[PDB]
Tab-separated table of N, CA and C in Angstrom:
chain	number	residue	atom	x	y	z
A	1	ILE	N	-15.332	-7.438	-10.452
A	1	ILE	CA	-13.829	-7.087	-10.761
A	1	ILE	C	-13.757	-6.547	-12.200
A	2	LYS	N	-14.779	-6.729	-12.972
A	2	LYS	CA	-14.825	-6.220	-14.324
A	2	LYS	C	-14.310	-4.791	-14.187
A	3	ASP	N	-15.246	-4.131	-13.253
A	3	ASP	CA	-15.050	-2.751	-12.898
A	3	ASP	C	-13.627	-2.320	-12.279
A	4	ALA	N	-13.168	-3.005	-11.277
A	4	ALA	CA	-11.933	-2.757	-10.571
A	4	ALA	C	-10.849	-2.463	-11.677
A	5	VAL	N	-10.664	-3.361	-12.632
A	5	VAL	CA	-9.744	-3.302	-13.629
A	5	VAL	C	-10.020	-2.196	-14.529
A	6	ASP	N	-11.260	-2.062	-15.086
A	6	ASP	CA	-11.659	-0.943	-15.844
A	6	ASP	C	-11.276	0.411	-15.193
A	7	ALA	N	-11.663	0.510	-13.988
A	7	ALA	CA	-11.392	1.627	-13.193
A	7	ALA	C	-9.913	2.059	-13.101
A	8	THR	N	-9.236	1.018	-12.799
A	8	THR	CA	-7.694	1.195	-12.760
A	8	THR	C	-7.110	1.793	-13.959
A	9	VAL	N	-7.539	1.211	-15.220
A	9	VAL	CA	-7.043	1.741	-16.417
A	9	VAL	C	-7.393	3.243	-16.523
A	10	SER	N	-8.661	3.606	-16.099
A	10	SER	CA	-9.029	5.067	-16.231
A	10	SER	C	-8.017	5.879	-15.310
A	11	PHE	N	-7.704	5.343	-14.163
A	11	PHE	CA	-6.718	6.028	-13.211
A	11	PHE	C	-5.478	6.350	-13.933
A	12	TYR	N	-4.931	5.285	-14.735
A	12	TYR	CA	-3.777	5.383	-15.437
A	12	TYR	C	-3.891	6.521	-16.509
A	13	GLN	N	-4.958	6.584	-17.181
A	13	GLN	CA	-5.113	7.600	-18.139
A	13	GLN	C	-5.176	9.022	-17.599
A	14	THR	N	-5.610	9.123	-16.386
A	14	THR	CA	-5.740	10.409	-15.740
A	14	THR	C	-4.351	10.892	-15.241
A	15	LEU	N	-3.609	9.721	-14.895
A	15	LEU	CA	-2.161	9.969	-14.313
A	15	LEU	C	-1.435	10.654	-15.496
A	16	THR	N	-1.642	10.225	-16.762
A	16	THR	CA	-1.005	10.618	-17.893
A	16	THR	C	-1.513	12.043	-18.225
A	17	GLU	N	-2.731	12.260	-18.072
A	17	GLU	CA	-3.189	13.652	-18.302
A	17	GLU	C	-2.576	14.540	-17.348
A	18	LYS	N	-2.439	14.281	-16.006
A	18	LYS	CA	-1.993	15.160	-14.958
A	18	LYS	C	-0.405	15.253	-15.056
A	19	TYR	N	0.243	14.114	-15.208
A	19	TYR	CA	1.798	14.126	-15.265
A	19	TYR	C	2.346	13.457	-16.467
A	20	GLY	N	3.583	13.153	-16.401
A	20	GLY	CA	4.096	12.504	-17.628
A	20	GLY	C	3.429	11.261	-18.108
A	21	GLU	N	3.630	10.879	-19.415
A	21	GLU	CA	3.117	9.771	-20.031
A	21	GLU	C	4.012	8.659	-19.331
A	22	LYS	N	5.254	9.177	-19.216
A	22	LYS	CA	6.411	8.376	-18.607
A	22	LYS	C	5.995	8.117	-17.170
A	23	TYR	N	5.381	9.105	-16.559
A	23	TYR	CA	4.994	8.952	-15.183
A	23	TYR	C	4.027	7.797	-14.970
A	24	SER	N	3.008	7.779	-15.744
A	24	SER	CA	1.971	6.841	-15.624
A	24	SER	C	2.417	5.411	-15.771
A	25	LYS	N	3.300	5.147	-16.727
A	25	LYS	CA	3.831	3.752	-16.887
A	25	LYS	C	4.693	3.310	-15.780
A	26	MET	N	5.419	4.271	-15.238
A	26	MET	CA	6.386	4.066	-14.082
A	26	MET	C	5.461	3.550	-13.048
A	27	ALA	N	4.268	4.107	-12.890
A	27	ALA	CA	3.286	3.700	-11.829
A	27	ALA	C	2.824	2.273	-11.943
A	28	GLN	N	2.570	1.955	-13.198
A	28	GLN	CA	2.107	0.596	-13.565
A	28	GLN	C	3.192	-0.398	-13.278
A	29	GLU	N	4.378	-0.119	-13.703
A	29	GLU	CA	5.512	-1.016	-13.481
A	29	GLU	C	5.501	-1.322	-11.935
A	30	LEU	N	5.388	-0.271	-11.142
A	30	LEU	CA	5.389	-0.391	-9.670
A	30	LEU	C	4.229	-1.193	-9.305
A	31	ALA	N	3.051	-0.966	-9.807
A	31	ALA	CA	1.866	-1.689	-9.332
A	31	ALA	C	2.042	-3.127	-9.635
A	32	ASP	N	2.574	-3.491	-10.881
A	32	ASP	CA	2.790	-4.936	-11.230
A	32	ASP	C	3.811	-5.512	-10.303
A	33	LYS	N	5.018	-4.911	-10.357
A	33	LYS	CA	6.051	-5.449	-9.460
A	33	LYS	C	5.707	-5.818	-8.058
A	34	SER	N	4.936	-5.108	-7.391
A	34	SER	CA	4.457	-5.280	-5.979
A	34	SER	C	3.683	-6.522	-5.679
A	35	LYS	N	2.857	-6.908	-6.677
A	35	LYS	CA	2.002	-8.081	-6.549
A	35	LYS	C	2.790	-9.274	-6.060
A	36	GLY	N	2.345	-9.678	-4.882
A	36	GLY	CA	3.025	-10.811	-4.326
A	36	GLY	C	4.100	-10.528	-3.215
A	37	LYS	N	4.866	-9.451	-3.401
A	37	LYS	CA	5.945	-9.137	-2.645
A	37	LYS	C	5.434	-8.628	-1.152
A	38	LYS	N	6.260	-9.059	-0.188
A	38	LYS	CA	5.975	-8.725	1.242
A	38	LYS	C	6.794	-7.525	1.531
A	39	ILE	N	6.594	-6.778	2.616
A	39	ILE	CA	7.413	-5.757	3.077
A	39	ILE	C	8.616	-6.255	3.795
A	40	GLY	N	9.854	-5.949	3.200
A	40	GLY	CA	11.092	-6.461	3.698
A	40	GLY	C	11.659	-5.648	4.944
A	41	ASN	N	12.881	-5.220	4.897
A	41	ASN	CA	13.607	-4.556	5.905
A	41	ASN	C	13.168	-3.063	5.657
A	42	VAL	N	12.284	-2.571	6.537
A	42	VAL	CA	11.756	-1.140	6.508
A	42	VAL	C	12.941	-0.234	6.605
A	43	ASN	N	14.087	-0.616	7.281
A	43	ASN	CA	15.219	0.252	7.414
A	43	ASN	C	15.992	0.596	6.107
A	44	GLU	N	16.029	-0.532	5.303
A	44	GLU	CA	16.765	-0.381	4.039
A	44	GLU	C	15.904	0.593	3.187
A	45	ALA	N	14.557	0.376	3.313
A	45	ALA	CA	13.651	1.273	2.573
A	45	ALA	C	13.729	2.682	2.995
A	46	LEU	N	13.740	2.976	4.310
A	46	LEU	CA	13.862	4.385	4.869
A	46	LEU	C	15.088	4.973	4.349
A	47	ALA	N	16.268	4.161	4.596
A	47	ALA	CA	17.596	4.603	4.177
A	47	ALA	C	17.689	5.122	2.680
A	48	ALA	N	17.059	4.332	1.837
A	48	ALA	CA	17.077	4.639	0.409
A	48	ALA	C	16.247	5.911	0.112
A	49	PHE	N	15.050	5.995	0.852
A	49	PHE	CA	14.129	7.130	0.717
A	49	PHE	C	14.726	8.407	1.244
A	50	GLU	N	15.343	8.431	2.396
A	50	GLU	CA	16.006	9.503	3.003
A	50	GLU	C	17.058	10.103	2.128
A	51	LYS	N	17.719	9.109	1.425
A	51	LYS	CA	18.796	9.442	0.396
A	51	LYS	C	18.268	10.232	-0.802
A	52	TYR	N	17.058	9.793	-1.279
A	52	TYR	CA	16.397	10.425	-2.449
A	52	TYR	C	15.801	11.732	-2.126
A	53	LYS	N	15.214	11.746	-0.938
A	53	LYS	CA	14.598	13.076	-0.351
A	53	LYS	C	15.479	14.265	-0.328
A	54	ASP	N	16.827	13.989	0.074
A	54	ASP	CA	17.740	15.138	0.182
A	54	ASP	C	17.978	15.635	-1.179
A	55	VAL	N	18.022	14.951	-2.160
A	55	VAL	CA	18.245	15.393	-3.536
A	55	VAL	C	17.022	16.043	-3.940
A	56	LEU	N	15.830	15.500	-3.895
A	56	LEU	CA	14.680	16.262	-4.216
A	56	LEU	C	14.578	17.553	-3.540
A	57	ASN	N	14.710	17.606	-2.151
A	57	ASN	CA	14.547	18.876	-1.435
A	57	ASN	C	15.547	19.887	-1.806
A	58	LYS	N	16.570	19.758	-2.606
A	58	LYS	CA	17.566	20.783	-3.033
A	58	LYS	C	16.920	21.405	-4.190
A	59	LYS	N	15.814	20.828	-4.878
A	59	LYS	CA	15.301	21.438	-6.024
A	59	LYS	C	14.037	22.221	-5.730
A	60	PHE	N	13.635	22.135	-4.450
A	60	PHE	CA	12.413	22.886	-3.917
A	60	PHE	C	12.633	23.616	-2.653
A	61	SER	N	12.005	24.691	-2.411
A	61	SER	CA	12.170	25.507	-1.238
A	61	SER	C	11.267	25.101	-0.170
A	62	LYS	N	11.507	25.538	0.987
A	62	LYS	CA	10.616	25.250	2.238
A	62	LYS	C	9.185	25.565	1.997
A	63	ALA	N	9.077	26.778	1.467
A	63	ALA	CA	7.738	27.416	1.095
A	63	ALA	C	7.159	26.502	0.095
A	64	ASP	N	7.798	25.818	-0.867
A	64	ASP	CA	7.315	24.952	-1.868
A	64	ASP	C	6.771	23.682	-1.300
A	65	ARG	N	7.517	23.055	-0.359
A	65	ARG	CA	7.003	21.944	0.362
A	65	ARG	C	5.778	22.276	1.087
A	66	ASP	N	5.845	23.283	2.113
A	66	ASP	CA	4.712	23.693	2.852
A	66	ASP	C	3.357	23.829	2.101
A	67	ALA	N	3.464	24.218	0.834
A	67	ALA	CA	2.224	24.412	0.016
A	67	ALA	C	1.583	23.013	-0.159
A	68	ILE	N	2.451	21.935	-0.299
A	68	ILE	CA	1.931	20.625	-0.454
A	68	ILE	C	1.154	20.171	0.929
A	69	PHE	N	1.756	20.332	2.063
A	69	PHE	CA	1.149	19.971	3.299
A	69	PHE	C	-0.102	20.844	3.421
A	70	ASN	N	-0.145	22.020	3.093
A	70	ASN	CA	-1.287	22.903	3.138
A	70	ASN	C	-2.455	22.403	2.289
A	71	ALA	N	-2.096	21.905	1.070
A	71	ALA	CA	-3.090	21.374	0.211
A	71	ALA	C	-3.774	20.126	0.818
A	72	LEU	N	-2.776	19.262	1.388
A	72	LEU	CA	-3.166	18.112	2.043
A	72	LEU	C	-4.180	18.300	3.197
A	73	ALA	N	-4.106	19.464	3.832
A	73	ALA	CA	-4.951	19.875	4.957
A	73	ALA	C	-6.359	19.951	4.731
A	74	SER	N	-6.603	20.119	3.403
A	74	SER	CA	-7.963	20.267	2.943
A	74	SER	C	-8.668	18.980	2.364
A	75	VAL	N	-7.939	17.933	2.389
A	75	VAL	CA	-8.495	16.626	1.889
A	75	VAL	C	-9.212	15.931	2.998
A	76	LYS	N	-10.396	15.377	2.716
A	76	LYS	CA	-11.071	14.581	3.688
A	76	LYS	C	-11.117	13.197	3.254
A	77	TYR	N	-10.806	12.309	4.119
A	77	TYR	CA	-10.694	10.867	3.987
A	77	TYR	C	-11.704	10.192	2.966
A	78	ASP	N	-12.935	10.613	3.146
A	78	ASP	CA	-13.958	10.049	2.286
A	78	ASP	C	-13.688	10.290	0.777
A	79	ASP	N	-13.065	11.389	0.442
A	79	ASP	CA	-12.699	11.658	-0.878
A	79	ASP	C	-11.819	10.764	-1.677
A	80	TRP	N	-10.750	10.204	-1.014
A	80	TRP	CA	-9.943	9.340	-1.671
A	80	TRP	C	-9.922	7.832	-1.268
A	81	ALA	N	-10.381	7.635	0.073
A	81	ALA	CA	-10.516	6.417	0.581
A	81	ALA	C	-11.545	5.578	-0.203
A	82	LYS	N	-12.395	6.234	-0.884
A	82	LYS	CA	-13.447	5.608	-1.804
A	82	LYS	C	-12.789	4.635	-2.732
A	83	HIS	N	-11.549	4.819	-3.196
A	83	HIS	CA	-11.015	4.055	-4.246
A	83	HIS	C	-10.203	2.695	-3.667
A	84	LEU	N	-10.112	2.700	-2.455
A	84	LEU	CA	-9.340	1.521	-1.776
A	84	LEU	C	-9.683	0.220	-2.305
A	85	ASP	N	-10.942	-0.282	-2.201
A	85	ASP	CA	-11.451	-1.633	-2.548
A	85	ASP	C	-11.064	-1.962	-4.015
A	86	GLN	N	-11.104	-0.992	-4.900
A	86	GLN	CA	-10.862	-1.064	-6.289
A	86	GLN	C	-9.486	-1.565	-6.530
A	87	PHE	N	-8.543	-0.867	-5.872
A	87	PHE	CA	-7.124	-1.127	-6.000
A	87	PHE	C	-6.921	-2.448	-5.363
A	88	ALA	N	-7.421	-2.726	-4.231
A	88	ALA	CA	-7.138	-3.941	-3.578
A	88	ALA	C	-7.547	-5.187	-4.538
A	89	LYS	N	-8.656	-4.978	-5.247
A	89	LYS	CA	-9.213	-5.914	-6.274
A	89	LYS	C	-8.245	-6.080	-7.418
A	90	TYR	N	-7.767	-4.898	-7.931
A	90	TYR	CA	-6.869	-5.002	-9.038
A	90	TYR	C	-5.577	-5.643	-8.713
A	91	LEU	N	-5.139	-5.364	-7.540
A	91	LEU	CA	-3.758	-5.917	-7.150
A	91	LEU	C	-3.915	-7.305	-6.545
A	92	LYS	N	-5.146	-7.871	-6.553
A	92	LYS	CA	-5.347	-9.177	-5.876
A	92	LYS	C	-4.886	-9.265	-4.490
A	93	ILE	N	-4.982	-8.212	-3.733
A	93	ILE	CA	-4.628	-8.335	-2.357
A	93	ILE	C	-5.513	-9.318	-1.719
A	94	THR	N	-4.979	-10.414	-1.196
A	94	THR	CA	-5.867	-11.513	-0.688
A	94	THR	C	-5.737	-11.442	0.865
A	95	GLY	N	-4.599	-11.137	1.427
A	95	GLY	CA	-4.478	-11.013	2.835
A	95	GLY	C	-5.488	-10.007	3.359
A	96	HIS	N	-5.280	-9.649	4.635
A	96	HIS	CA	-6.198	-8.829	5.341
A	96	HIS	C	-5.853	-7.419	4.847
A	97	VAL	N	-6.858	-6.570	4.967
A	97	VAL	CA	-6.713	-5.131	4.534
A	97	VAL	C	-7.041	-4.095	5.592
A	98	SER	N	-6.103	-3.263	6.037
A	98	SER	CA	-6.485	-2.199	7.129
A	98	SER	C	-7.138	-1.033	6.206
A	99	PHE	N	-8.442	-1.114	6.153
A	99	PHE	CA	-9.242	-0.126	5.425
A	99	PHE	C	-9.373	1.332	6.069
A	100	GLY	N	-9.440	1.305	7.343
A	100	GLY	CA	-9.717	2.644	8.043
A	100	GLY	C	-8.509	3.369	8.459
A	101	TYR	N	-7.351	3.299	7.773
A	101	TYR	CA	-6.222	4.068	8.051
A	101	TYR	C	-6.044	5.362	7.254
A	102	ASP	N	-5.963	6.497	7.904
A	102	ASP	CA	-5.923	7.782	7.222
A	102	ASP	C	-4.463	8.270	7.170
A	103	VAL	N	-3.780	7.886	6.229
A	103	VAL	CA	-2.292	8.266	6.065
A	103	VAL	C	-2.080	9.782	6.083
A	104	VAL	N	-3.049	10.467	5.367
A	104	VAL	CA	-2.863	12.005	5.357
A	104	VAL	C	-2.707	12.627	6.712
A	105	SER	N	-3.274	12.192	7.822
A	105	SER	CA	-3.099	12.835	9.150
A	105	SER	C	-1.667	12.589	9.623
A	106	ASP	N	-1.099	11.389	9.146
A	106	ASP	CA	0.296	11.088	9.445
A	106	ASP	C	1.257	11.948	8.746
A	107	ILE	N	0.985	12.085	7.403
A	107	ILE	CA	1.934	12.875	6.615
A	107	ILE	C	1.964	14.310	7.068
A	108	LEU	N	0.771	14.767	7.409
A	108	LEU	CA	0.665	16.251	7.946
A	108	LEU	C	1.590	16.419	9.167
A	109	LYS	N	1.591	15.452	10.039
A	109	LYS	CA	2.504	15.593	11.222
A	109	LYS	C	3.935	15.968	10.793
A	110	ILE	N	4.436	15.476	9.635
A	110	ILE	CA	5.698	15.611	9.164
A	110	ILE	C	6.078	17.110	8.812
A	111	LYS	N	5.121	17.851	8.522
A	111	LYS	CA	5.336	19.197	8.161
A	111	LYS	C	6.052	19.902	9.257
A	112	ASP	N	5.850	19.446	10.525
A	112	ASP	CA	6.570	20.060	11.639
A	112	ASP	C	7.863	19.442	12.014
A	113	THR	N	7.831	18.112	12.087
A	113	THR	CA	8.945	17.440	12.438
A	113	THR	C	10.122	17.098	11.522
A	114	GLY	N	9.655	16.863	10.141
A	114	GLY	CA	10.658	16.634	9.238
A	114	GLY	C	11.057	15.166	9.261
A	115	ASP	N	10.492	14.329	10.127
A	115	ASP	CA	10.732	12.974	10.418
A	115	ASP	C	9.876	12.038	9.728
A	116	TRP	N	10.404	11.123	8.849
A	116	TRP	CA	9.662	10.160	8.088
A	116	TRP	C	9.683	8.720	8.758
A	117	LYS	N	10.519	8.476	9.628
A	117	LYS	CA	10.681	7.282	10.360
A	117	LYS	C	9.367	6.707	10.763
A	118	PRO	N	8.576	7.434	11.657
A	118	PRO	CA	7.225	6.997	12.118
A	118	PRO	C	6.442	6.423	10.969
A	119	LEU	N	6.270	7.260	9.915
A	119	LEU	CA	5.496	6.914	8.760
A	119	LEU	C	5.791	5.542	8.185
A	120	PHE	N	6.974	5.253	7.955
A	120	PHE	CA	7.457	3.956	7.423
A	120	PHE	C	7.232	2.920	8.322
A	121	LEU	N	7.503	3.071	9.504
A	121	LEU	CA	7.145	2.020	10.518
A	121	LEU	C	5.680	1.719	10.500
A	122	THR	N	4.871	2.793	10.440
A	122	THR	CA	3.494	2.520	10.534
A	122	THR	C	2.975	1.914	9.231
A	123	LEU	N	3.509	2.316	8.208
A	123	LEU	CA	3.147	1.650	6.929
A	123	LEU	C	3.318	0.109	6.906
A	124	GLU	N	4.454	-0.247	7.527
A	124	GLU	CA	4.816	-1.693	7.721
A	124	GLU	C	3.711	-2.325	8.600
A	125	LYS	N	3.381	-1.836	9.685
A	125	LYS	CA	2.467	-2.281	10.582
A	125	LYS	C	1.054	-2.440	10.084
A	126	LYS	N	0.509	-1.533	9.310
A	126	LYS	CA	-0.888	-1.522	8.895
A	126	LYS	C	-0.920	-2.470	7.713
A	127	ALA	N	0.142	-2.690	6.825
A	127	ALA	CA	0.206	-3.621	5.787
A	127	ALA	C	-0.095	-5.037	6.381
A	128	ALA	N	0.548	-5.236	7.544
A	128	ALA	CA	0.396	-6.458	8.218
A	128	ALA	C	0.687	-7.656	7.171
A	129	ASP	N	-0.112	-8.656	7.199
A	129	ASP	CA	0.162	-9.778	6.273
A	129	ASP	C	-0.175	-9.470	4.794
A	130	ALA	N	-0.666	-8.375	4.423
A	130	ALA	CA	-1.006	-8.040	3.123
A	130	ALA	C	0.221	-7.701	2.234
A	131	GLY	N	1.339	-7.347	2.846
A	131	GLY	CA	2.548	-6.921	2.077
A	131	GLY	C	2.657	-5.508	1.541
A	132	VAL	N	3.449	-5.345	0.389
A	132	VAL	CA	3.676	-4.090	-0.320
A	132	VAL	C	2.544	-3.575	-1.058
A	133	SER	N	1.671	-4.445	-1.544
A	133	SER	CA	0.490	-4.145	-2.352
A	133	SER	C	-0.477	-3.270	-1.581
A	134	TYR	N	-0.453	-3.283	-0.248
A	134	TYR	CA	-1.407	-2.552	0.530
A	134	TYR	C	-0.891	-1.128	0.393
A	135	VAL	N	0.410	-0.924	0.466
A	135	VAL	CA	1.014	0.385	0.346
A	135	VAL	C	0.574	1.131	-0.913
A	136	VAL	N	0.505	0.305	-2.020
A	136	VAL	CA	0.218	0.853	-3.390
A	136	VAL	C	-1.282	1.121	-3.377
A	137	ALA	N	-2.081	0.238	-2.964
A	137	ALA	CA	-3.503	0.608	-2.924
A	137	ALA	C	-3.790	1.870	-2.161
A	138	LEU	N	-3.164	1.963	-1.101
A	138	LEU	CA	-3.415	3.232	-0.168
A	138	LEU	C	-2.943	4.549	-0.850
A	139	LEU	N	-1.603	4.555	-1.240
A	139	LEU	CA	-1.171	5.696	-1.835
A	139	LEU	C	-1.770	6.103	-3.233
A	140	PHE	N	-2.205	5.015	-4.059
A	140	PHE	CA	-2.757	5.184	-5.340
A	140	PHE	C	-4.117	5.794	-5.208
A	141	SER	N	-4.802	5.347	-4.140
A	141	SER	CA	-6.111	5.815	-3.759
A	141	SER	C	-6.002	7.414	-3.495
A	142	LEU	N	-4.790	7.744	-2.780
A	142	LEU	CA	-4.670	9.072	-2.430
A	142	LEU	C	-4.458	9.936	-3.753
A	143	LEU	N	-3.613	9.382	-4.668
A	143	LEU	CA	-3.394	10.112	-5.875
A	143	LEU	C	-4.689	10.227	-6.648
A	144	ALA	N	-5.606	9.132	-6.554
A	144	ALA	CA	-6.736	9.052	-7.326
A	144	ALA	C	-7.705	10.195	-6.987
A	145	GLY	N	-7.717	10.539	-5.565
A	145	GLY	CA	-8.607	11.582	-5.153
A	145	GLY	C	-8.005	13.092	-4.832
A	146	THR	N	-6.758	13.427	-5.571
A	146	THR	CA	-6.195	14.682	-5.348
A	146	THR	C	-5.440	15.067	-6.540
A	147	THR	N	-5.107	16.337	-6.489
A	147	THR	CA	-4.188	16.857	-7.713
A	147	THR	C	-3.021	17.642	-6.863
A	148	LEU	N	-1.965	16.921	-6.754
A	148	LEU	CA	-0.883	17.523	-5.897
A	148	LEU	C	0.256	18.111	-6.817
A	149	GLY	N	1.121	18.869	-6.244
A	149	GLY	CA	2.180	19.523	-7.007
A	149	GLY	C	3.295	18.497	-7.148
A	150	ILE	N	4.126	18.707	-8.061
A	150	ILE	CA	5.237	17.794	-8.383
A	150	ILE	C	5.983	17.267	-7.207
A	151	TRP	N	6.375	18.231	-6.189
A	151	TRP	CA	7.061	17.742	-4.995
A	151	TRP	C	6.224	16.605	-4.194
A	152	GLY	N	5.087	16.713	-4.075
A	152	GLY	CA	4.179	15.703	-3.475
A	152	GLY	C	4.091	14.400	-4.231
A	153	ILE	N	4.128	14.489	-5.651
A	153	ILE	CA	4.054	13.349	-6.465
A	153	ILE	C	5.370	12.523	-6.334
A	154	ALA	N	6.470	13.357	-6.319
A	154	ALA	CA	7.783	12.881	-6.213
A	154	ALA	C	8.072	12.086	-4.843
A	155	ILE	N	7.465	12.659	-3.750
A	155	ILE	CA	7.665	12.161	-2.436
A	155	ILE	C	6.840	10.801	-2.382
A	156	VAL	N	5.535	10.955	-2.831
A	156	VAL	CA	4.716	9.702	-2.858
A	156	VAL	C	5.266	8.569	-3.672
A	157	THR	N	5.896	8.906	-4.839
A	157	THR	CA	6.545	7.931	-5.614
A	157	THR	C	7.726	7.334	-4.933
A	158	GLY	N	8.497	8.300	-4.323
A	158	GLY	CA	9.665	7.847	-3.552
A	158	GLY	C	9.400	6.827	-2.478
A	159	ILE	N	8.228	6.806	-1.771
A	159	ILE	CA	7.943	5.859	-0.851
A	159	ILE	C	7.717	4.489	-1.462
A	160	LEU	N	6.991	4.495	-2.743
A	160	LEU	CA	6.754	3.398	-3.497
A	160	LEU	C	8.009	2.814	-3.983
A	161	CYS	N	8.978	3.471	-4.605
A	161	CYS	CA	10.118	2.893	-5.026
A	161	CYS	C	10.932	2.304	-3.910
A	162	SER	N	10.964	2.943	-2.691
A	162	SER	CA	11.873	2.563	-1.616
A	162	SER	C	11.237	1.136	-1.015
A	163	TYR	N	10.020	0.961	-1.033
A	163	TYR	CA	9.376	-0.499	-0.551
A	163	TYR	C	9.465	-1.574	-1.639
A	164	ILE	N	9.231	-1.083	-2.878
A	164	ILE	CA	9.159	-1.998	-4.005
A	164	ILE	C	10.456	-2.009	-4.688
A	165	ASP	N	11.299	-2.893	-4.337
A	165	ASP	CA	12.623	-3.226	-4.877
A	165	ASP	C	13.301	-2.422	-6.051
A	166	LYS	N	12.513	-2.010	-6.974
A	166	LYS	CA	13.237	-1.355	-8.068
A	166	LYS	C	13.470	-0.053	-7.534
A	167	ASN	N	14.741	0.223	-7.129
A	167	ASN	CA	15.100	1.488	-6.690
A	167	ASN	C	15.377	2.294	-7.924
A	168	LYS	N	14.385	2.723	-8.629
A	168	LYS	CA	14.392	3.492	-9.758
A	168	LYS	C	14.197	4.957	-9.211
A	169	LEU	N	14.688	5.163	-8.046
A	169	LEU	CA	14.576	6.456	-7.385
A	169	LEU	C	15.235	7.436	-8.267
A	170	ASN	N	16.323	7.048	-8.907
A	170	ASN	CA	17.152	7.952	-9.829
A	170	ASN	C	16.447	8.294	-11.034
A	171	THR	N	15.279	7.699	-11.317
A	171	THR	CA	14.445	7.863	-12.575
A	171	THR	C	13.314	8.732	-12.407
A	172	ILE	N	12.897	8.879	-11.146
A	172	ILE	CA	11.743	9.768	-10.691
A	172	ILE	C	11.773	11.172	-11.296
A	173	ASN	N	12.964	11.806	-11.012
A	173	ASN	CA	13.175	13.200	-11.423
A	173	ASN	C	13.103	13.327	-12.838
A	174	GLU	N	13.441	12.360	-13.625
A	174	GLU	CA	13.505	12.310	-15.117
A	174	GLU	C	12.088	12.245	-15.523
A	175	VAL	N	11.328	11.139	-15.044
A	175	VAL	CA	10.068	10.871	-15.502
A	175	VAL	C	9.159	12.042	-15.218
A	176	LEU	N	9.596	12.981	-14.123
A	176	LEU	CA	8.779	14.095	-13.820
A	176	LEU	C	9.196	15.467	-14.364
A	177	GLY	N	10.544	15.511	-14.813
A	177	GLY	CA	11.042	16.617	-15.346
A	177	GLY	C	11.605	17.742	-14.278
A	178	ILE	N	12.291	17.213	-13.246
A	178	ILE	CA	12.752	18.163	-12.306
A	178	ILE	C	14.301	17.875	-11.991
């Protein structure tokens, strides 16, 4: 675990390198906050996310978003899934861990439908008894193995705020500069 924690800190500095300094700390706040929390009413979460999404989408064009799905089409699971255990260790996830879930294939389906409902419901199901910290380990691992455009960072962060009670959804745009 010496490593898990050391590695996580490295992650945080790269987050700072890639995005805001503000961004990186926001991530930590979220990482911290989740420890222990279980996944609540997935509906309340979707509801809050869909509300933030509309705002975000008014600042980016269709073509802008598509660029994000297209970048994701080139990511292979092995590339980011490699960080899963490390995050699980740092977050102290003690419950069961659905290791073999490839979120990226799920997000890709959204490019065509525009429907986020399925994703949320499956994030709840795969977290199982592990709670909200599984969602963090999962998505942080994704961030760890990619360099996405602001829109994608905003969306991924939006999913995190929506499940992790601090609906600091209104602060995302600020932390990112959009």
